[PDB]
Design a protein around this nucleic acid. Structure first.
Lengths: 222, 848, 50, 834
RNA sequence: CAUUGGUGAGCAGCGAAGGAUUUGGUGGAUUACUAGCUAAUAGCAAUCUAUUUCAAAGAAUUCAAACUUGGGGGAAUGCCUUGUUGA
């Protein structure tokens, strides 16, 4: 299928999921292929989890956590329909955010679901993490982004961002800015600390399908 | 030569005829514009599928082709036609009476060059136009300036200049003004091709001996020369990937690649196109790639690539030879025999006189393949023996196929020329089948046939004998002898019952086949040249020798029709799929369509090029014929599949309505005494009787929840006299004592409206309306049409006003009218008599 | 029901039944199914049953 | 005799796609599996087009002159059909999964929404004869960002409204003069845009969204341009819109929600006119007729078609079919009705001419495996895996009996006596043929003696013997009545699995597992001929197969068989893609019919595609329910390995083509075969094939017309029968006069008697000249009765057609005339009022 | 006497400038042919940017929102719903 990239935080390995079943985990510099899975349910996304030794892929319904070789370790039951995966890696928390519209933080080191939050605003269209902060920005079909935390049932802050749904958000390394992009052909640069939008671009020629803020504050939009 | 049943469609199995094709980038990708006589076809250069085909057949053949981004220019007899996506977008007639040889387009200018050395220049009206149309000027080549014109080029960066390479020198014109700014020194040979290089200033000129001159035009001097000795150069192309290569394509088929950095000869390719049909007519390196496309007048188009080196550093001293990427083709020589393979009208076998049997596709013209001849390992444990240098089978002159065992044993029989057996071919695997079928008295197979069930193959010879062979096992079963001269047609019934054979001693012999008796012997006048059988109806047609077609009923065993009217010998012919027509093509260049009911010609086409086979499709959409010159198959549609076709005799003039359209509209009412019903539907009676219970069944089970403020006159307000029309019409009918118009209205209401009116009759003291309605019904049953609906209306009237007339019974007017009603109706109880008798005796006859 | 669908119907049936039920006098056109024609007419009870 | 064309497709009313009304308001076109049907609502006449898509249909539109039809399947593969003469003009594939086609209301040019592009093309011309490419592109526009989903023209066809999954809608002009008039876009929806329509004079625009919301746009001041004047909202719980339509002359909006409701709104004010529950399943499409007052709903899940008359609330039709779920059929003893026994539990009496279910019986619980009429038209007996075999009346519509088991086994075949007093049934469970007596609902006997389950039963209707056959590898001929109780077995080579008795009662044809049809003689016990079949049978490969089709012995045998009513042909059909029609004396086959070409069924291709199979495995076999945008389309219940029971998605496998059961027609020249996509009904035209009889040189249509015009009526008639041309026979048939009818009927020849009977039947059921026909029939039977009586079997079908004509269409006219007569006599003789 | 079991040495017969098994690679077919890209009524294809921004239009369920859970007992602390004290 259409593919999906995830570079391991370290920098070395890469994980590509298809959309039909083709998952593969590789090294990309030495060319050596770690694992390869031809599972046929539509995968959506994947992450590495702490090493290259573990990864977690979405699937048709559940979440499957595999080894470094693709021997399946676990079938996560309680993460039903996770279109988005992320891993916040000092706290060791695998985070999925769904199509149900529920947000689940799962500790992959002891094996015990920490929190199960209810984002009530519908199926989550985008998701990113503040790395300096480890707090989850989920972007919702109202056009509003919302910042969560695991020990709080209510969103830490709601941020009315676009008109119509929020396609993709991406947060600086320094933990201080957030670019978000929206289906009304829009793109907005917010200053998360102090929560004011810096400056906003209001007519792109076709919707911003993705954004990413690099390791040097440089912005990529697609 | 306009016809009334068949119309021409396209001509399958042509790829190139030898005009140098043109190429066109379109974006990042390439297309190939080739011309086939009077058309041009456009191929996806990456995978070679047939994108487009020229829309209408040009008046003459196409002399020159050139392409650009979305447009493609063809210069036929006198004119230049600019086409986009196939459809003609501009004509451009050149003010002369001499043909257009060459053609080059650069910038604002189109440049056409006639044969009497003249150059016409057409300039765009404004550069926001997309192809030029203003006549600009007309530059001419006087014989002291140069020989005849050979080609037109425009080198890069040359502002308003045109490089005219003539047969002795190269000229440079300044086409905006048109002063001959430059002449080159006379070459001591004949120049044959020219082509511009991807270096600046330089045109590569290929002479008539093996000499390619790289000629620098800004300086006007040669910079290089390259000698092939004893070849005729016919193509030049400059590989522009980055490796400095050259492909000279000789007019013998060699294609010789030079390496111009290292002065070497990289390679040759030998017999990639045939020496006779022209050699290599065009051979181009696609701009940017290691791909060369070559095309020659043997109806084929080929693509060769360059693999990269094997060696890491040494690189471009080890050059890999160029191998063969992909190609299409057709027959080189005109075809010899055609036959539809399957009954969806998908695939068509056709054998051609270069001994090659293609199988063409009518839907997608990439599915077409050549049926290979790679023999099987002999089944005996021996050696099959032939000349070790291989050559194709002799020309396939008869051919018969069945699709009933496809996949399990072979199912084509072919009969070759001056050769004494037949070969079973395959059709699933597309390959020569494992059996060869002898004739066993030294006689050349003159005609072949296959059983319906696909088990048996009959092989009539030329000394009379008939041999029958099993096809699963190739093994000889039976052998009859009845003829003494040649045997020119064999046939077998679809019940495997009766066999027919027709032979040049003018005999048609009929055999039984389950058992082996001889069932009859019919004798005609003349030799019998061809048999076509038609199976579903058991009729067959023998093309005799005395220029006649004779149709014979293969059961009652006698001649049923005799179609005269031809004038030279009959080449070939075919029954319709439905058994009704014969198409027959004869050597006076005509094709005639005969109708067998009326036994006479109903159509005829006079063809400029004699037709030599004629075959319907089995699913009867098309007619495929094939002609004496030109490699293809001409496909024709069938207006009788879409329309009505009048059957009348015409041949006198060129070379009732019931029958002539063979359709009969039924009568309204035969006799005045004879009953009828209503024409229309049949459930009109039953809905008019039970209109209420039906609607109460139909109503939805609950109630529908609606709003509370409903704008009461909605049936009115969907936007965009005194008495009712029916009652008015009834009243004037009662005045004039004629209710014809009333009965028109009651026949052509609807059930709701009928019930509404008959409820809405007046029913009070002077019962004028009930009296007048009953009078109208009496008059209707008298007129004796529509017995059905007049009885139905009377039943409705008794339902909706039976109370008032039962009460006001023995009022005189109602008494009188109901008596007159009873008059006609008691006359009409005979119908119940008939029906009672019919099913009494019918059920008795059935049950006993 | 699930166990029949799983077993791909080849089961063994119920034991039995016999349970009384009530039918109404009604015309046959009012009994059948909704489409422009009709097929049958006679009333749904029999003369002996009325 | 052996020329059969695809007449009709019965038993399916709608499968998927888009429902359209005609230009007239009269006919209704609706896509069955990969074919369009035309159901004619006024003249009560149906048909099914002959051409077939290679996958299921997904868009149709019909021209405004009623002339061309374009049907696009999934994957853009359009086919253009000449609607008048029913023969395909041009195949053309648009690559993408195309989603709607609308002709222009002028009928010049047709617009097609494919992907995110709008391609406007021009029609061909119907008068112009065919060519290589007649579709000439007009423009392609490219506004949207995701798929288009809908498409609406102007009433004066120059503006086009497209709605798209973009959450938006756009107006495109049709002239590059008027681009400025139409460059704007619409906005603000939250969810999708499932329709956007024009007003009645195009000064207002409405846009309807899946979220449940209707916007009213108007070109107005606070220059000024296109505000949202109003917003109205539906308020469903969790239903969403699934299809919207707007008839602008009446200003109706009819909206089909995903729960089973639909609502008819009156739009420039938004008042609820009406609201009803169609079913319980999402309504998939809506249309309306022209004048605005027959709505047309269609619901693909469970497959039901409904046509509504919203003024006075009345279903003009409310019907529903069976995909894949039918186990048998059996004709009425008249060729007009057909009964289908469905896997649900439902038995449906289907009319033939107008393909609509007259009646539906649902007293069974589990699937229904066999149906037979009696030798009557009254009762039919039906057998199901309930465990009971139930008798049905068909005048008062009732179970008058249910014979039961004695331990409740699962009954799998049914057979019942001519004088319908004894019913035998046999199961695949017990291998003992149970015999019940009809009147006393108790079971007479359990005829036992097979060793292996009973696969078929039948009754020789002449001599009354019960021949049954079982996986025993035997046949047993039981002679049940009349002090005998003796039984005679026959060994067949292998494992028999269907049976068929001759009409005559002397022969049994038996279709076994090795692939023969062995035809035995019953008075003796001896085999008077078999026909070897394993070869001429087209078994395809499944996508889930790992073995070639030439080895796949899933389907190299015939599980159903039936003689003719003449004694000469056998139709057999099976678990494969082909129906084969053999001739019984000559042992050689006449035609092989292919049931379908539908690559959304499994057994249908012979050779798969190697572009599909890859390292993962096959490529049609991944799951894509994740790709779907809707919860009920993601949910995949499927109890693992549930081979053919339960609903269609209670298994994760694609359907297989199979013929469940085959029969001939007892009156016409046809046969009918119940298969995966419905009941294929195949039939015949003498009015097309030239099949003369006993010709000679001097017999032309011109000569027979001449024989009429000099009045040798007998000779003109026999020349018509020799030439065998239907118009001609009709012509002379109506020429000859009523005084001269009896002498001619006496002097006709014996050879042409069956043909004249066939012609009278074919003219008679649908013509009007009832005196002409009944005078003819009376003379024909009257002068040649006894000959018919002797040759009882050549005339089986012919006399059944005449007898159906008499009791079906003549007899009612007798009834109404007689009723009327007696009412008059009562009204005018009785005592006066008061 | 068989061998319907191997492993070989030899004929008859077939037999045109050789034959017989095995295997890698690429091309074409496997569904019925209307050309490439983009911001798309057009331009590009040697190039989208030194007009690529404006104006207009565009903001319900004031939160419908897991139709998404293997069975049995439960729930300190969580979560959740209903009440409540003080601001």
């Amino acid at each position: 299928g259409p593919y999906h990239i995830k570079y391991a935080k370290n920098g070395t390995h890469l994980l590509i999921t298809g959309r039909k079943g083709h998952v593969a985990s590789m090294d990309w510099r030495k060319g050596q292929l770690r694992a390869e899975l031809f599972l046929n349910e539509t995968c959506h996304s994947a992450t590495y989890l702490q090493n290259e030794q573990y990864f977690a892929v979405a699937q048709k319904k559940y979440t499957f956590i595999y080894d470094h070789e693709g021997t399946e370790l676990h079938r996560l039951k309680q993460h039903i329909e996770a279109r988005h995966l992320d891993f916040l890696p000092y706290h060791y928390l695998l985070v999925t955010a769904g199509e149900t519209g529920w947000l689940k933080y799962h500790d992959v080191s002891t094996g015990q679901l920490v929190s199960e939050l209810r984002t009530k605003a519908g199926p989550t269209m985008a998701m990113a993490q503040n790395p300096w902060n480890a707090v989850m920005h989920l972007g919702h079909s109202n056009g509003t982004v919302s910042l969560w935390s695991p020990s709080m049932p209510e969103p830490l802050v709601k941020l009315l961002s676009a008109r119509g749904p929020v396609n993709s958000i991406a947060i600086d390394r320094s933990g201080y800015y957030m670019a978000t992009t929206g289906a009304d052909r829009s793109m907005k640069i917010w200053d998360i600390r102090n929560f004011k939008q810096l400056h906003s671009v209001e007519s792109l020629p076709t919707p911003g399908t993705n954004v990413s803020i690099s390791d040097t504050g440089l912005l990529a939009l697609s | 030569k306009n016809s009334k049943i068949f119309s021409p469609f396209r001509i399958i199995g042509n790829v190139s005829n030898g005009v140098p094709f043109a190429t066109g980038t379109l974006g990042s990708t390439f297309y190939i514009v080739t011309c086939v006589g009077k058309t041009f076809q456009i191929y996806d250069a990456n995978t070679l599928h047939l994108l487009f085909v020229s829309e209408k057949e040009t008046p003459s053949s196409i002399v020159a082709l050139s392409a650009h981004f979305h447009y493609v220019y063809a210069a036929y007899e006198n004119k230049v036609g600019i086409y986009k996506r196939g459809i003609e977008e501009h004509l451009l007639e050149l003010e002369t009476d001499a043909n257009v040889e060459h053609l080059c387009i650069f910038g604002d200018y189109l440049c056409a060059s006639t044969d009497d050395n003249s150059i016409f220049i057409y300039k765009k009206s404004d550069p926001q136009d997309k192809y030029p149309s203003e006549f600009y000027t007309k530059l001419t080549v006087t014989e002291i300036q140069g020989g005849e014109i050979v080609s037109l080029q425009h080198l890069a960066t040359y502002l308003n200049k045109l490089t005219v390479v003539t047969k002795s020198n190269v000229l440079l014109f300044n086409v905006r003004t048109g002063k001959l700014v430059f002449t080159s020194n006379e070459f001591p040979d004949q120049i044959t091709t020219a082509e511009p290089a991807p270096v600046l200033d330089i045109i590569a000129l290929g002479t008539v001996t093996g000499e390619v001159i790289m000629f620098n035009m800004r300086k006007g001097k040669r910079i290089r020369t390259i000698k092939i000795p004893q070849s005729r150069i016919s193509s030049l192309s400059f590989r522009t990937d980055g490796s400095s290569h050259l492909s000279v394509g000789t007019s013998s088929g060699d294609l010789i690649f030079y390496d111009l950095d290292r002065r070497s000869r990289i390679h040759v390719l030998k017999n990639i196109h045939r020496e006779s049909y022209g050699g290599v007519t065009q051979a181009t390196f696609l701009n940017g790639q290691p791909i060369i496309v070559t095309s020659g007048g043997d109806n084929s188009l080929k693509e060769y690539v360059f693999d990269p080196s094997l060696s890491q550093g040494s690189g471009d001293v080890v050059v890999q030879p160029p191998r063969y990427l992909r190609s299409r083709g057709g027959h080189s020589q005109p075809p010899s025999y055609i036959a539809f393979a399957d009954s969806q009208s998908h695939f068509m076998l056709s054998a051609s006189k270069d001994r090659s049997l293609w199988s063409f596709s009518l839907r997608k013209d990439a599915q077409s393949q050549e049926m290979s001849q790679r023999l099987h390992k002999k089944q005996d444990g021996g050696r099959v023996g032939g000349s070790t240098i291989k050559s194709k089978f002799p020309e396939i002159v008869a051919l018969a196929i069945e699709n009933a065992r496809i996949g399990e044993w072979e199912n084509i029989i072919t009969a070759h020329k001056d050769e004494k057996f037949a070969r079973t071919w395959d059709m699933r695997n597309k390959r020569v089948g494992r059996w060869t079928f002898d004739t066993t008295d030294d006689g050349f197979v003159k005609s072949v046939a296959m059983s319906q069930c696909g088990n048996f193959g009959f092989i009539g010879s030329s000394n009379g004998s008939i041999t029958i062979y099993n096809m699963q096992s190739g093994i000889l079963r039976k052998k009859y002898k009845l003829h003494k001269r040649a045997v020119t047609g064999i046939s077998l019934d679809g019940m495997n019952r009766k066999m027919v054979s027709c032979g040049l001693d003018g005999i048609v012999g009929f055999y039984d086949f389950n058992k082996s008796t001889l069932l009859g012997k019919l004798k005609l006048d003349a030799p019998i040249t061809a048999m076509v059988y038609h199976r579903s109806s058991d009729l067959f047609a023998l093309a005799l020798d005395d220029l006649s077609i004779v149709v014979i009923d293969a059961v009652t065993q006698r001649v049923v029709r005799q179609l005269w009217g031809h004038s030279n010998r009959i080449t070939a012919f075919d029954f319709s799929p439905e058994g009704r027509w014969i198409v027959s093509a004869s050597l006076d260049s005509t094709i005639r369509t005969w109708d067998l009911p009326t036994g006479g010609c109903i159509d005829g086409i006079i063809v400029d090029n004699v037709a030599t086979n004629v075959k319907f499709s089995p699913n009867g959409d098309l007619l495929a014929t094939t002609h004496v010159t030109g490699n293809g198959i001409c496909i024709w549609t069938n207006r009788a599949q879409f329309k009505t076709v009048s059957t009348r005799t015409i041949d006198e003039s060129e070379f009732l309505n019931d029958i002539d359209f063979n359709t009969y509209t039924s009568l309204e009412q035969i006799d005045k005494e004879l009953l009828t019903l209503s024409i229309g539907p049949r459930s009109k009676m039953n809905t008019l009787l039970h209109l209420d219970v039906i609607r109460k069944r139909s109503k939805p089970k609950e109630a529908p929840k609606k709003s509370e403020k409903l704008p009461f006159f909605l049936q009115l307000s969907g936007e965009k006299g005194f008495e009712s029309h029916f009652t008015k019409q009834l009243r004037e009918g009662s005045q004039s004592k004629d209710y014809s118009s009333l009965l028109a209205t009651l026949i052509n209401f609807s059930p709701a409206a009928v019930d509404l009116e008959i409820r809405s009759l007046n029913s009070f003291e002077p019962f004028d309306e009930i009296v007048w309605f009953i009078d109208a019904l009496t008059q209707g049953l008298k007129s004796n049409k529509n017995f059905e609906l007049y009885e139905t209306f009377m039943s409705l009237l008794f339902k909706a006003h039976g109370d008032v007339i039962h009460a006001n019974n023995k009022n005189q007017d109602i008494a009188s009218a109901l008596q007159n009603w009873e008059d006609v109706h008691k006359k009409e109880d005979r119908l119940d008599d008939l029906v009672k008798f019919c099913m009494g005796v019918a059920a008795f006859v059935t049950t006993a | 029901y699930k166990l029949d669908v799983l077993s791909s119907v080849h089961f063994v049936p119920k034991p039995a039944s016999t349970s009384l039920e009530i039918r109404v006098e009604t015309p046959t056109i009012s009994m059948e199914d909704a489409q422009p024609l009709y097929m049958s007419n006679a009333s749904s009870l029999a003369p002996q049953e009325i | 005799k052996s020329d059969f064309k695809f007449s009709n497709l019965l038993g399916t009313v709608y499968r998927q796609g888009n429902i359209t009304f005609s230009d007239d308001g009269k006919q209704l076109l609706s896509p069955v599996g990969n074919r369009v049907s035309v159901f004619d609502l006024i003249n009560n006449k149906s048909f099914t087009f002959e051409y077939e898509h290679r996958k299921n249909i997904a868009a149709i539109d019909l021209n405004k002159q009623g002339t061309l039809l374009i049907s696009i399947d999934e994957d853009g593969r359009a086919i253009l059909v000449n609607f008048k003469a029913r023969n395909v003009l041009h195949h053309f594939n648009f690559k993408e999964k195309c989603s709607a086609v609308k002709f222009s209301p002028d009928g010049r040019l047709f617009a097609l929404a494919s992907g995110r592009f709008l391609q406007i093309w021009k029609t061909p011309d119907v008068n112009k004869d065919r060519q290589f490419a007649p579709f000439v592109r007009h423009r392609v526009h490219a506004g949207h960002f995701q798929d288009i989903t809908s498409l609406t023209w102007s009433q004066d066809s120059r503006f086009i409204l497209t709605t798209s999954k973009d959450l938006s809608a756009k107006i495109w002009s049709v002239d590059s003069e008027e681009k400025n008039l139409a460059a704007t876009t619409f906005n603000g929806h939250r969810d999708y845009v499932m329709g956007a329509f024009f007003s009645h004079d195009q000064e207002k625009i409405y846009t309807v969204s899946k979220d449940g919301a209707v916007f009213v746009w108007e070109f107005t001041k606070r220059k000024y341009s296109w505000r949202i004047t109003k917003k109205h909202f539906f308020y469903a719980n969790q239903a969403k819109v699934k299809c919207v339509t707007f008839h602008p002359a009446t200003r109706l909006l009819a909206v089909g929600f995903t729960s089973g409701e639909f609502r008819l709104y009156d739009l420039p004010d938004f008042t609820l006119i009406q609201q009803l529950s169609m079913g319980q399943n999402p309504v998939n499409t809506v249309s309306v007729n022209q004048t605005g007052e027959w709505l047309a709903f269609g619901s693909s899940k469970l497959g039901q078609l409904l046509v509504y008359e919203w003024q006075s609330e009345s279903y003009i039709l409310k019907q529903q079919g069976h995909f894949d779920s039918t186990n048998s059929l059996a004709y009425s003893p008249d060729g007009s009705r057909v009964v289908t026994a469905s896997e649900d539990g439902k038995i449906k009496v289907w009319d033939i001419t107008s393909g609509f279910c007259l009646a539906t019986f649902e007293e069974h619980t589990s699937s229904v495996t066999a149906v037979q009429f009696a030798k009557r038209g009254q009762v039919m007996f039906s057998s199901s895996l309930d465990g009971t075999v139930r008798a049905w009346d068909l005048i008062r519509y009732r179970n008058f009996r249910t014979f039961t088991g004695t331990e409740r086994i699962q009954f799998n075949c049914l057979a019942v006596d001519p004088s319908g007093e004894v019913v035998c049934a046999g199961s695949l469970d017990n291998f003992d043929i149970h015999v019940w007596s009809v009147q006393t609902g108790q079971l007479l006997d359990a005829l036992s003696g097979h060793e292996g389950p009973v696969s078929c039963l039948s009754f020789s209707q002449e001599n009354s013997v019960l021949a049954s056959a079982s996986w025993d590898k035997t046949i047993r001929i039981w002679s049940i009545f009349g002090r005998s109780q003796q039984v005679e077995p026959i060994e067949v080579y292998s494992d028999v699995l269907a049976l068929s008795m001759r009409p005559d009662g002397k022969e049994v044809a038996v279709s076994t597992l090795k692939g023969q049809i062995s035809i035995f003689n019953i008075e003796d016990a001896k085999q008077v001929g078999n026909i070897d079949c394993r070869k001429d049978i087209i078994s395809g490969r499944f996508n889930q197969d790992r073995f070639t089709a030439k080895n796949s012995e899933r389907s190299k045998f015939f599980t159903t068989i039936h003689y003719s009513f003449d004694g000469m042909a056998i139709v057999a059909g099976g678990n494969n893609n082909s129906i084969c029609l053999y001739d019984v004396p000559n042992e050689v086959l006449l035609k092989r019919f292919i049931v379908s070409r539908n690559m959304a069924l499994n057994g249908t291709l012979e050779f798969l595609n190697s572009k599909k199979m890859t390292e993962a495995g096959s490529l049609d076999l991944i799951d894509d329910a994740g790709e779907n945008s809707d919860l009920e389309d993601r949910i995949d219940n499927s109890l693992p390995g549930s081979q053919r029971g339960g609903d269609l998605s209670t298994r994760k496998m694609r359907p297989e083509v199979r013929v469940t059961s085959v029969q001939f027609s007892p009156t016409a020249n046809a046969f009918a075969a119940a298969s995966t996509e419905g009941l294929l009904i195949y039939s015949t035209n003498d009015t097309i094939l030239f099949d003369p009889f006993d010709l000679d040189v001097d017999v032309t249509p011109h000569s027979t017309v001449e024989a009429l015009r000099e009045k040798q009526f007998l000779n003109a008639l026999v020349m018509a029968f020799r030439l065998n041309e239907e118009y001609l026979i009709n012509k002379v048939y109506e020429a000859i006069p009523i005084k001269e009818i009896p002498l001619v009927a006496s002097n006709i020849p014996a050879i042409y008697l069956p043909r004249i009977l066939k012609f009278i039947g074919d003219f008679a059921i649908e013509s009007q000249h009832i005196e002409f026909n009944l005078i003819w029939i009376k003379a024909l039977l009257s002068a040649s009765g006894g000959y018919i009586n002797e040759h009882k079997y050549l005339f089986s079908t012919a006399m059944r057609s005449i007898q159906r004509f008499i009791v079906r269409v003549a007899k009612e006219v007798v009834n109404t005339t007689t009723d009327n007569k007696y009412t008059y006599r009562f009204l005018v003789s009785t005592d006066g009022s008061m």
